[PDB]
Design a binder for this molecule. Structure first.
Ligand code: ZN
Length: 66
DNA sequence: CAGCGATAGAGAC
DNA sequence: GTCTCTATCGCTG
């Protein structure tokens, strides 16, 4: 389609967040967003998802990213 | 050209 | 000053 816009709604099975810079996955084949896969895998233990937030701090960038 | 992993940085008190 | 949590970068095919 010429729309090219959104067509596949990915869902984080851990926090349902649809806003993320990189989609991660669990060694079990379950889809995760950014922090869920990075944080859960490194901790190996469940932790209050209460850390759920819709606001993410944006960091600086390189001179130019193609 | 795009996607991913690992490491390090920053913030608040 | 120290500690924790999260994101981006660089590299390869
Ligand atoms: Zn998530």
């Amino acid at each position: 389609m010429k729309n090219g816009e959104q067509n596949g709604p990915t869902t984080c099975t851990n926090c349902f967040t649809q806003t993320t810079p990189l989609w991660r996955r669990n060694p079990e084949g379950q889809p995760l967003c950014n922090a869920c896969g990075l944080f859960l895998k490194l901790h190996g233990v469940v932790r209050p998802l209460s850390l759920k937030t819709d606001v993410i701090k944006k960091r600086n960038r390189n001179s130019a990213n193609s």
